[PDB]
Amino acid sequence: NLWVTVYYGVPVWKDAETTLFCASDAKAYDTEKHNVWATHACVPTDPNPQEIHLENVTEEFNMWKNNMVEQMHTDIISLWDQSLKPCVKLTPLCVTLQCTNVTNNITDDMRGELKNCSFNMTTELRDKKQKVYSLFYRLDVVQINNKEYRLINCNTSAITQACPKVSFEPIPIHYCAPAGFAILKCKDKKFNGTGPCPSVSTVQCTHGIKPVVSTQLLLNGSLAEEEVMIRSENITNNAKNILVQFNTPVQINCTRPNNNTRKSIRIGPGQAFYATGDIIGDIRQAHCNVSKATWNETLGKVVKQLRKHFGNNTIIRFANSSGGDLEVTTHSFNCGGEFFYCNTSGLFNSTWISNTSVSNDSITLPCRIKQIINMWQRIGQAMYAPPIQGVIRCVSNITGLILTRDGGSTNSTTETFRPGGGDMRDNWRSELYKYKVVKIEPLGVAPTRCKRR
Amino acid sequence: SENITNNAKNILVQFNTPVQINCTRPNNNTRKSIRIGPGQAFYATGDI
Amino acid sequence: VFLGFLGAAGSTMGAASMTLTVQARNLLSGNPDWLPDMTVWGIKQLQARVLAVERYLRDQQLLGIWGCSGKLICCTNVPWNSSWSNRNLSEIWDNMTWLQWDKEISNYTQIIYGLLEESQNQQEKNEQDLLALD
Amino acid sequence: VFLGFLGAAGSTMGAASMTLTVQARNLLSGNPDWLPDMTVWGIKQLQARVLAVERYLRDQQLLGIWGCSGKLICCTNVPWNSSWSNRNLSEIWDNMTWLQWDKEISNYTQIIYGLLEESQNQQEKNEQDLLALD
Amino acid sequence: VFLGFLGAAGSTMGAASMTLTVQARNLLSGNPDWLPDMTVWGIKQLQARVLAVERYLRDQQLLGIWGCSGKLICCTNVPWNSSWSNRNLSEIWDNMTWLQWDKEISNYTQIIYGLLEESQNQQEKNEQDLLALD
């Protein structure tokens, strides 16, 4: 009465993990920065993003078991490694540096930590050697015991200088799906992160994502939809991080005010080292301003979404960081080339009543600067940031948060959400939560009435 | 053998029963990790 | 109705059969142009789009060893078994998706390929050879 | 007459149709043997001969989605449109090259593929399914 | 009887013809998964399994240019030549292996491909075009 029949090209997908592509955004030829982040290899963007909504399709997404985040993490790591491979190495810089405090410690109650170091470096030739100076900045040893000093970067790993021609400005990079596979994108405004998406669309290329390395605060991220989102792999477990996505962007303006200069001292037959020159003009610490009204409103909007998980008409608190690594306890990011480590101790001093909290036009945050970074998971290499000639001012949208809850028997009392971070993957789950990779299996069978021969 | 008549060509022998061998370095040795360069670290044979 | 690529993933199997070329044409050619010569990053995506065509050719070998061969709809001579999805007609093609269909068949799907590769061309070809001489 | 590979590029389309296998056999297998293992120079030519087979498989998918499927000469059921090259027979096959032909068709060539992929198998297959039960 | 892959290498050609799908299914998919990204060792095996599919596609082009096209048993219209293996029927299919067969044909095998590619589709297609108008 009825026989089996094959059908090729049926809408059947199975969730799997494979290698993805990457987009060139199409403005790469007009940037002409020689090499940005992924301007190296990615292909230009299609003229029309094929975004096709699939009606009557509900698909179970799980952002915490996703494999796109691992792909993007390994890609960023290999990006760092292949960008720093052909640049200038600075292994002869690990010498002894007789340093001196800056000539302006006016009012020693306030801090001033830049060391006018001088040292005998190797020159163009190998026979002679020349004495240079001006390494500066806080990161250094306290010497073994004009005071002697050396580099703790040398106490850890080898050092290489970042190429001065390349840039660190994040270009919009959106991953694309290869042949045979597709990317399901959730579309409803409120998404639990783990669960069935009722409004699903399909694409090959995703939406533009800027690779930003940041802690405690997500910068230049994608805004949420109408509501602030509180995502977590397991809200009961304290050890698991708490990701927060904002509805309205928080304005932040960071400034390195030191109208700085550079010195190109020649070392080796081809290499050339860029040293931080003398500070022309007055000196003061780098900082970051955030409008106090916007931050107040953002906190008052996030607390109500947190009360949905931890009780109505209850109090929550959040102090500053606990302690540990400098990259974990401080909002660390990059701007213009200089790496800012700011302390958010001035933003998290709050207790919340059921209706209010317990002028000042803006809140300023001090910020130290670091040029040598051991953020690489390969503890065999470290990068020297080349000095930026001039004043630095960079604006940004704050869009997310990473929080950790204090464990213990704090049920009857209140809960604390101290800032944290560390894992780079948490920075990517705020952008790839709505995306899942699926493979197409177009071979189906079904019974119909027909006969051959 | 590739050619048993030719002397220069080696002669391979495969056993039926395995011959037990026990090799020992008895020097209860130690190591020293001396740091060299900014990242490298050389492992030297310590005192016996 | 088209509704583009995978538009009928939640529609009936009959309505989904109206868009076979749509799902077929976008799986094989997701062509990336790899003219820039970048060292370690090309091998991963190259392995990806090579395993893609390997899987595609595995599917094509499976669709060639059977009596079916046209990359389209096709009928066979293997009877449907009442043990596999005890359902009548129009109950399948008008209240079921291909996802749930493959889910219910997944328990008995593995023997159907064998019944299509052996009970057909291992005997249909031999009958074709012994019935083409007259 | 053979005249080898591409020998009839300037001859008539009818005479050029006599050498289809000649142009077909030399495009797919320009086989280079890459047994030597040389680092950065292999990826470029490997990408080249992989994009070659990708383009070949794109052409094969286009020639499979149509009612035509044999890698040979083939006839369809889509009528020729008088708007496309207002010319009679023997005027095309005896005083025209395939180059100038594709040049004149290039203005209207893009819709012919759609008329061959949709007006045919999106209806010919469905008619085959609804006329094979009796 | 199956006897697995290449089981009938020393059996008769008739018994060996009973296991064509067995030798066909294990040559194309010896799939290695190359998810680990290892530098200089991947290019060699990648070249290997790419030349594998290149040879496979050469064989498929040879089996497509002929009147045969189904990846199965098939008959042609080129007569067997008495100069090629002066043997009767049942003498070949019941006391000979495919190895010795190809060995005896290797002296005259090179012209058979030409007789199959030219004496067939270079005339069979043209007869099909000039006999399909009525």
Ligand SMILES: *[C@@H]1O[C@H](CO)[C@@H](O[C@@H]2O[C@H](CO)[C@@H](O)[C@H](O)[C@H]2NC(C)=O)[C@H](O)[C@H]1NC(C)=O
């Ligand atoms: C960050 O910088 C921007 C631009 O410098 C500031 O925006 C300005 O705000 C002032 C005061 O409200 C206005 O008078 C200007 O017209 C604004 N300019 C632009 C271009 O928008 C912003 O206020 C700064 N934010 C903080 C927290 O300092």
Ligand SMILES: *[C@@H]1O[C@H](CO)[C@@H](O)[C@H](O)[C@H]1NC(C)=O
């Ligand atoms: C001067 O340098 C010494 C170096 O040991 C440091 O301890 C001290 O705090 C510095 N004083 C300043 C910066 O006023």
Ligand SMILES: *[C@@H]1O[C@H](CO)[C@@H](O)[C@H](O)[C@H]1NC(C)=O
């Ligand atoms: C520098 O720091 C020292 C303390 O180490 C302090 O006594 C001195 O006043 C500061 N300023 C100058 C100009 O030395």
Ligand SMILES: *[C@@H]1O[C@H](CO)[C@@H](O)[C@H](O)[C@H]1NC(C)=O
């Ligand atoms: C740093 O010391 C050098 C001497 O090596 C001197 O020429 C230079 O002016 C000093 N800079 C400052 C800011 O004190």
Ligand SMILES: *[C@@H]1O[C@H](CO)[C@@H](O)[C@H](O)[C@H]1NC(C)=O
């Ligand atoms: C979201 O998913 C988690 C998974 O554990 C579940 O417990 C929770 O009820 C879901 N909904 C909300 C609003 O969190």
Ligand SMILES: *[C@@H]1O[C@H](CO)[C@@H](O)[C@H](O)[C@H]1NC(C)=O
């Ligand atoms: C920074 O210093 C240089 C050198 O004194 C000066 O020419 C320049 O104008 C300064 N920057 C600004 C923004 O004025």
Ligand SMILES: *[C@@H]1O[C@H](CO)[C@@H](O)[C@H](O)[C@H]1NC(C)=O
């Ligand atoms: C946090 O604030 C306290 C003072 O309230 C301060 O002593 C501490 O250094 C700050 N930072 C950390 C990481 O605790």
Ligand SMILES: *[C@@H]1O[C@H](CO)[C@@H](O)[C@H](O)[C@H]1NC(C)=O
């Ligand atoms: C922040 O909002 C609270 C609640 O209205 C208010 O008490 C406090 O004064 C605000 N802080 C400002 C305006 O700096």
Ligand SMILES: *[C@@H]1O[C@H](CO)[C@@H](O)[C@H](O)[C@H]1NC(C)=O
């Ligand atoms: C974010 O975007 C702004 C554009 O205003 C840019 O200046 C900045 O470098 C970007 N990155 C960060 C970390 O702020």
Ligand SMILES: *[C@@H]1O[C@H](CO)[C@@H](O)[C@H](O)[C@H]1NC(C)=O
């Ligand atoms: C911040 O968000 C506003 C709101 O859409 C947008 O206009 C602006 O370009 C954003 N800036 C950055 C640096 O993302």
Ligand SMILES: *[C@@H]1O[C@H](CO)[C@@H](O)[C@H](O)[C@H]1NC(C)=O
């Ligand atoms: C080797 O020497 C160490 C140090 O004296 C000792 O602790 C250890 O027990 C010795 N090895 C054995 C097998 O006893």
Ligand SMILES: *[C@@H]1O[C@H](CO)[C@@H](O)[C@H](O)[C@H]1NC(C)=O
């Ligand atoms: C259906 O399958 C069962 C077990 O798989 C088998 O015993 C039976 O003979 C099959 N019937 C048909 C008609 O295929």
Ligand SMILES: *[C@@H]1O[C@H](CO)[C@@H](O)[C@H](O)[C@H]1NC(C)=O
């Ligand atoms: C579709 O509806 C029929 C009758 O209402 C029911 O028997 C059948 O199980 C339904 N299909 C599915 C997949 O549940």
Ligand SMILES: *[C@@H]1O[C@H](CO)[C@@H](O)[C@H](O)[C@H]1NC(C)=O
């Ligand atoms: C020919 O093409 C024109 C426009 O492309 C169209 O209006 C007309 O119906 C077509 N006629 C045929 C017979 O295909």
Ligand SMILES: *[C@@H]1O[C@H](CO)[C@@H](O)[C@H](O)[C@H]1NC(C)=O
């Ligand atoms: C071939 O000749 C005919 C008549 O001489 C003419 O109408 C036609 O246009 C010619 N072909 C071309 C391509 O010019």
Ligand SMILES: *[C@@H]1O[C@H](CO)[C@@H](O)[C@H](O)[C@H]1NC(C)=O
């Ligand atoms: C057989 O081959 C010979 C030489 O190859 C040729 O002369 C003869 O015509 C052929 N006969 C047939 C029937 O093919």
